[PDB]
Design a protein around this motif. Structure first.
Motif, PDB file in Angstrom:
ATOM      1  N   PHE F  35      -9.395 -46.430  42.519  1.00 38.76           N
ATOM      2  CA  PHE F  35      -8.618 -46.473  43.755  1.00 38.76           C
ATOM      3  C   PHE F  35      -8.658 -45.108  44.423  1.00 38.76           C
ATOM      4  O   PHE F  35      -7.819 -44.241  44.183  1.00 38.76           O
ATOM      5  CB  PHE F  35      -7.180 -46.867  43.469  1.00 38.76           C
ATOM      6  CG  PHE F  35      -6.986 -48.311  43.211  1.00 38.76           C
ATOM      7  CD1 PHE F  35      -6.978 -49.207  44.247  1.00 38.76           C
ATOM      8  CD2 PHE F  35      -6.780 -48.770  41.934  1.00 38.76           C
ATOM      9  CE1 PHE F  35      -6.780 -50.528  44.015  1.00 38.76           C
ATOM     10  CE2 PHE F  35      -6.583 -50.096  41.701  1.00 38.76           C
ATOM     11  CZ  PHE F  35      -6.588 -50.977  42.745  1.00 38.76           C
ATOM     12  N   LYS F  36      -9.642 -44.913  45.282  1.00 34.74           N
ATOM     13  CA  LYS F  36      -9.607 -43.706  46.088  1.00 34.74           C
ATOM     14  C   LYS F  36      -8.866 -43.982  47.388  1.00 34.74           C
ATOM     15  O   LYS F  36      -8.457 -45.108  47.671  1.00 34.74           O
ATOM     16  CB  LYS F  36     -11.013 -43.189  46.368  1.00 34.74           C
ATOM     17  CG  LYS F  36     -11.057 -41.679  46.549  1.00 34.74           C
ATOM     18  CD  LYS F  36     -12.455 -41.131  46.359  1.00 34.74           C
ATOM     19  CE  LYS F  36     -13.334 -41.419  47.552  1.00 34.74           C
ATOM     20  NZ  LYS F  36     -14.718 -40.900  47.382  1.00 34.74           N
ATOM     21  N   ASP F  37      -8.678 -42.935  48.181  1.00 31.10           N
ATOM     22  CA  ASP F  37      -8.110 -43.086  49.508  1.00 31.10           C
ATOM     23  C   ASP F  37      -8.861 -42.184  50.470  1.00 31.10           C
ATOM     24  O   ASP F  37      -9.331 -41.110  50.097  1.00 31.10           O
ATOM     25  CB  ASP F  37      -6.620 -42.746  49.535  1.00 31.10           C
ATOM     26  CG  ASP F  37      -6.356 -41.311  49.201  1.00 31.10           C
ATOM     27  OD1 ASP F  37      -7.143 -40.739  48.427  1.00 31.10           O
ATOM     28  OD2 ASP F  37      -5.366 -40.752  49.708  1.00 31.10           O
ATOM     29  N   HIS F  39      -9.035 -40.018  54.247  1.00 29.49           N
ATOM     30  CA  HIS F  39      -8.277 -38.838  54.653  1.00 29.49           C
ATOM     31  C   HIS F  39      -6.878 -39.264  55.097  1.00 29.49           C
ATOM     32  O   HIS F  39      -6.530 -39.279  56.279  1.00 29.49           O
ATOM     33  CB  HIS F  39      -9.021 -38.076  55.738  1.00 29.49           C
ATOM     34  CG  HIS F  39      -9.716 -38.954  56.729  1.00 29.49           C
ATOM     35  ND1 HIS F  39     -11.007 -39.400  56.552  1.00 29.49           N
ATOM     36  CD2 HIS F  39      -9.304 -39.457  57.915  1.00 29.49           C
ATOM     37  CE1 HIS F  39     -11.358 -40.147  57.583  1.00 29.49           C
ATOM     38  NE2 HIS F  39     -10.343 -40.197  58.425  1.00 29.49           N
ATOM     39  N   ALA F  40      -6.080 -39.649  54.106  1.00 36.31           N
ATOM     40  CA  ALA F  40      -4.659 -39.965  54.189  1.00 36.31           C
ATOM     41  C   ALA F  40      -4.374 -41.226  54.989  1.00 36.31           C
ATOM     42  O   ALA F  40      -3.204 -41.510  55.240  1.00 36.31           O
ATOM     43  CB  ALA F  40      -3.825 -38.818  54.780  1.00 36.31           C
ATOM     44  N   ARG F  42      -6.166 -44.504  54.574  1.00 37.84           N
ATOM     45  CA  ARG F  42      -6.807 -45.706  54.067  1.00 37.84           C
ATOM     46  C   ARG F  42      -6.648 -45.757  52.557  1.00 37.84           C
ATOM     47  O   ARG F  42      -6.052 -44.870  51.943  1.00 37.84           O
ATOM     48  CB  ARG F  42      -8.287 -45.749  54.441  1.00 37.84           C
ATOM     49  CG  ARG F  42      -8.596 -46.419  55.750  1.00 37.84           C
ATOM     50  CD  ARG F  42     -10.025 -46.148  56.160  1.00 37.84           C
ATOM     51  NE  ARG F  42     -10.972 -46.525  55.119  1.00 37.84           N
ATOM     52  CZ  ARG F  42     -11.375 -47.770  54.898  1.00 37.84           C
ATOM     53  NH1 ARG F  42     -10.906 -48.763  55.639  1.00 37.84           N
ATOM     54  NH2 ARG F  42     -12.243 -48.026  53.931  1.00 37.84           N
ATOM     55  N   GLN F  43      -7.182 -46.818  51.964  1.00 42.71           N
ATOM     56  CA  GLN F  43      -7.388 -46.880  50.529  1.00 42.71           C
ATOM     57  C   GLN F  43      -8.628 -47.712  50.263  1.00 42.71           C
ATOM     58  O   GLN F  43      -8.941 -48.638  51.012  1.00 42.71           O
ATOM     59  CB  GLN F  43      -6.186 -47.465  49.800  1.00 42.71           C
ATOM     60  CG  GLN F  43      -5.370 -46.429  49.085  1.00 42.71           C
ATOM     61  CD  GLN F  43      -4.701 -46.984  47.863  1.00 42.71           C
ATOM     62  OE1 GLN F  43      -4.515 -48.188  47.744  1.00 42.71           O
ATOM     63  NE2 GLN F  43      -4.346 -46.114  46.936  1.00 42.71           N
TER      64      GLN F  43
END
Lengths: 492, 121, 109, 75, 98, 49, 75, 49
Positions: F35-37, F39-40, F42-43
């Motif tokens: 689970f990345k996101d 630049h603040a 999205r995911q």
């Protein structure tokens, strides 16, 4: 506008050359530039696209094996010889096998067994080179003033390539923002390969993509590839002195995913690949910027708050107002006040000057402003109809300076010299600091800079104890190096 | 800037249908798409949505489970594969599209002409 | 649960030249994120107003929008013959469960 | 194959997160903790070897830590 | 592993926390974080929101381990005698019954 | 293969618990899913290969 | 996931060769050699740190070797 | 709180671990432990189940 809620924006308030102000742009946040008598502009770096990359050295991360064969000659002969040993598409392994008088040849030495297997590839991944030329940046900028909270002449988009490092954003009625950038200089792409495995793309250092123990082609493949290694994916295990068996290792695609760590993800559309994390440095020639709102008569009808006055993350306050009268294009009077007996301007109003440009019946506009730390009143209006709002800010100037130092430290940890270039109108203290930082950073990257969050935390604690107890001037030398490493880490 | 809808037709209860919505005149990838239906004698009902990039999808409780929204940005086409149809799904379906920089939010939208789907026993 | 919108009269009988006023009441606070659509039989619904006061591109000036707390109002100053249709309000608050009102019909009196 | 050099050596530094950032911390700590928990007696062996090495107390403790670090990795 | 239809949910800087109804299903992996929200995105306030994302998990194949008791395991010993055998009967296991 | 215990228990992979009967259940979908996101804003969910 | 403990810790001992035997000696040597070849500056830094630690010559040499082994593994 | 239809499952002292199909439901509370078992209960072996 366009940088209100970003939560990673910084203000480059100030211009002491009457002219260009240097600014370093990052994918994370954006920059609001406010000058003395010029409109506040928000500038953001959006996407970095790469095009027509050149395939280089694709690896084969999943093998398939084929018709194995073998030969053995009796213990006293030459060597076993498969005819498929002179084919560069087969892996062949030679060993010694127990043989004699039971297997069919009378003598009891060790025999020679050769086994060959045909190699096939599935799912190879490939790397491509990014030349400094032919990568494009896209910068989006917008202006404050008359845009309500929701051909535009208030927003512009600029394409920058090493072939065209400078461009002008024509803001109709505001003039034009000249914009020079260092595109070759801004992120090193002379060490980064674009890597794809299966519809997933990364940026990979061009030293992690040459020490890889996997079968590798070179360049693009006209037809069926020839892979040189023939090992490190095929395993010739030996039975208990009588046989040879050939197996392949499975698909390797999960070890590569974990071998990649600290590599930047990307995405691809057609022949173009968008990176979403970069770093660009531009000088902003703001000397053809005007104000679209001087020589306007003050709006005097009424004002209504349409949503509420809200607080951004950095302290500023956004207000969305509706004008009732129809005065044509006219100026908005607004200020931050305390002691409504004597309306005295306290604080600073970020938007340059707020002018209503649409006059049909009711208009909407959005401004923001930087209030003082105590209680205060947002005062919008002139007389007897100046709607006001009560607004409270949290933290004393000391906390603000502390947070500013923390932001500067993080920006330094991320960039280095280019961080020294962020607010650099340019003097002699600034250039000297940048030079000494260049020297120290080169030395530090040479010595350290081969570790990741744990090796360097360990060496940091180790030298911290060392400098704590060594009783010399090396005390200070170490403790400084330790501060460097440990902040470089704890920034995260 | 237009949305052309197609695929509507009469079907029996429990039948499966696939509705298509071709977009033209704009960058399809930057537009969040939505499906809104209107039953005869009823108001507009917002049933489904999908982000611009296809990452995430939303289905209303009235359709959650049976209907599947999807999109192909290369063919500029929105698809609404509706299975296990019931007579209550007989309605005119419109595909709408709006410029979005956030998962589903949009301000100014664009509507298609709509297509009728009839589920009668 | 989900936000619901209520359009007060469900039917408005007025004559060409009169002043039309339609109201939309939300079940919970939505700051300004309300849209007004005009729907004519045989035609796709047309966006009239977004952000509860801002007229869409090409919308004539006779349509106006106002907000007070949770009560939104769509005003048609000078009723035109082509202005007799159904009118819907839609909430655009923060995520898709987006809903429409039951609709109010402007009928010729 | 077996080696596969880690890319965290050349960690690309930027504002955005890297490929697998959330894992590194627990990665190394978990490997070490697991290996030690499975083989406890080597703690005693390392204590003895560290005590035999190094004059001062700090040197012996540092030897202990570095042995207990280098063993689980078989580096 | 293989992944499937993702979904997500967000909240105001000052509301509760996001909740997808697919969090009550033990077939979905769900993760919760904070996202910048406000005034462009859809709610008037500017802090960090809360975003939940869920995705369906499916495994094409898995490896399995089995236990071995020290009973129910058999050894097979082959023995032979010198004397009269000709060299042929060294690696020949066809009839040892007779 | 023949495998020791404590090497078939210290494995960080999604594991069922014996009798696979109906709908499969995995104790951990953790680390088989990343689970990345962005630049603040999205995911993103990816699987490791 | 990322950790995946090696089985060589519990190597099964018998006459027959194990799963991947021929790669055990080369594996670790290649990892260490490659990492050092890429980063010599850390060789200098580790020499300095080892010199600062440890009284006798042998203690300093052992510290140097143990640092040069711990660094490539990030153990 | 209010509790409802309990259920349980046990395993061979030397098998894997017990698994109810109601562990794949987020409406149940499930707890796993070791029980004395063997040769009287039905499984020939004597370790903990």
């Amino acid at each position: 506008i366009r940088c209100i809620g970003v939560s990673n924006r910084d203000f480059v308030e100030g211009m002491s050359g009457g002219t260009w102000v240097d600014v370093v742009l990052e994918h994370g946040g954006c920059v609001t530039v406010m000058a003395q008598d010029k409109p506040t502009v928000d500038i953001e770096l959006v996407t970095t696209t790469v095009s027509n990359m050149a395939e280089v050295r694709s690896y084969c991360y999943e093998a398939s094996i084929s018709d194995m064969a073998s030969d053995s000659r009796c213990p006293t002969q030459g060597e076993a010889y498969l005819d498929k040993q002179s084919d560069t598409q087969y892996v062949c392994k030679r060993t010694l096998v127990d043989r004699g008088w039971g297997n069919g040849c009378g003598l009891f030495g060790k025999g020679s067994l050769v086994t060959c297997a045909k190699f096939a590839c599935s799912k190879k991944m490939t790397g491509k080179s990014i030349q400094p030329e032919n990568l494009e940046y896209r910068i989006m900028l917008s202006v404050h003033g008359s845009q309500h909270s929701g051909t535009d002449e208030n927003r512009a988009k600029v394409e920058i390539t090493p072939n065209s490092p400078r461009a002008e954003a024509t803001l109709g009625g505001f003039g034009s923002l000249g914009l020079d950038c260092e595109p070759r200089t801004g992120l090193d792409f002379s060490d980064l390969y674009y890597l794809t495995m299966n519809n997933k793309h990364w940026l990979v250092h061009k030293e992690w993509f040459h020490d890889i123990p996997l079968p590798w082609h070179a360049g693009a493949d006209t037809g069926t590839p020839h892979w040189n290694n023939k090992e490190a994916l095929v395993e010739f295990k030996d039975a208990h002195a009588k046989r040879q068996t050939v197996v392949v290792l499975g698909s390797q695609e999960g070890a590569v995913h974990t071998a990649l760590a600290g590599a930047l993800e990307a995405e691809m559309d057609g022949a173009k690949g968008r990176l979403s994390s970069g770093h660009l440095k531009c000088r902003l020639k703001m000397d053809k910027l005007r104000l679209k709102g001087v020589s306007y008569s003050l709006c005097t009808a009424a004002f209504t708050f349409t949503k509420i006055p809200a607080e951004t993350l950095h302290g500023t306050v956004t207000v969305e107002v509706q004008y009732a009268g129809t005065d044509g294009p006219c100026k908005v009077p607004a200020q931050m006040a305390v002691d409504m007996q004597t309306l005295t301007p306290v604080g600073r109003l970020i938007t340059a000057n707020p002018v209503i440009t649409e006059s049909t019946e009711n208009s909407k506009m959005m401004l923001e402003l930087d209030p003082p730390f105590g209680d205060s009143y947002i005062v919008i209006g002139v007389g007897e109809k100046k709607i006001t709002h009560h607004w409270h800010r949290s933290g004393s100037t000391i906390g603000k300076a502390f947070e500013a130092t923390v932001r500067g430290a993080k920006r330094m940890a991320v960039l280095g010299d280019t961080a020294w270039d962020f607010g650099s109108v340019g003097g002699a203290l600034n250039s000297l600091g940048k030079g000494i930082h260049q020297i120290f950073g080169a030395a530090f990257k040479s010595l350290f800079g081969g570790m990741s969050w744990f090796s360097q935390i360990l060496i940091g604690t180790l030298l911290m104890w060392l400098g704590l107890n060594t009783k010399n001037g090396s005390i200070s030398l170490m403790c400084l190096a330790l501060g460097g490493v440990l902040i470089f880490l704890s920034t995260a | 800037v237009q949305l052309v809808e197609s695929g509507g037709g009469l079907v029996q209860p429990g039948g499966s249908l696939r509705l298509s919505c071709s977009a033209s005149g704009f960058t399809f990838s930057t537009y969040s798409m939505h499906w809104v239906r209107q039953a005869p004698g009823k108001g507009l009902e917002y049933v489904s949505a999908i982000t611009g990039e296809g990452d995430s999808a939303f289905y209303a409780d009235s359709v959650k489970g049976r209907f599947t929204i999807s999109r192909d940005n290369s063919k500029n086409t929105l698809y609404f594969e509706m299975n296990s149809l019931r007579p209550e799904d007989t309605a005119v379906y419109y595909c709408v599209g709006g410029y979005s920089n956030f998962y589903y939010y949009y301000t100014m939208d664009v509507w298609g002409q709509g297509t009728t789907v009839t589920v009668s026993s | 649960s989900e936000i619901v919108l209520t359009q007060s009269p469900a039917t408005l009988s007025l004559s060409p030249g009169e002043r039309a006023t339609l109201s939309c009441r939300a079940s919970q606070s939505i700051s300004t994120f309300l849209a007004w659509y005009q729907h004519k039989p045989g035609q796709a619904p047309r966006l009239l107003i977004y952000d509860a006061s801002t007229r869409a591109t090409g919308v004539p000036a006779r349509f106006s929008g106002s907000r007070s707390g949770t009560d939104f109002t769509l005003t048609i100053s000078t009723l035109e013959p082509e202005d007799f249709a159904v009118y819907y309000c839609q909430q655009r608050y923060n995520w898709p469960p987006y809903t429409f009102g039951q609709g109010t019909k402007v009928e010729i009196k | 194959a077996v080696t596969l050099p880690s890319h965290s050596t050349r960690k690309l530094q930027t504002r955005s997160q890297t490929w697998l950032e959330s894992r590194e911390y627990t990665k190394h700590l978990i490997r070490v903790e697991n290996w030690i928990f499975r083989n406890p007696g080597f703690a005693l062996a390392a204590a003895a070897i560290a005590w035999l090495l190094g004059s001062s107390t700090s040197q012996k403790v540092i030897y202990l830590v570095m042995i207990l670090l280098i063993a689980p990795a078989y580096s | 592993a293989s992944i499937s239809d993702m979904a997500s949910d967000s909240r105001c800087p000052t509301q509760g926390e996001a909740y997808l109804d697919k969090q009550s299903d033990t077939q979905y992996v769900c993760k919760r974080t904070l996202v910048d929200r406000g005034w462009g995105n859809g709610c008037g306030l500017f802090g960090k929101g809360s975003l939940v994302t869920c995705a369906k998990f499916a495994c094409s194949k898995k490896m399995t381990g089995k236990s071995i008791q020290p009973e129910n395991l058999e050894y097979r010993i082959m023995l032979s005698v010198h004397g009269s055998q000709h060299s042929g009967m060294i690696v020949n296991d066809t009839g040892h019954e007779t």
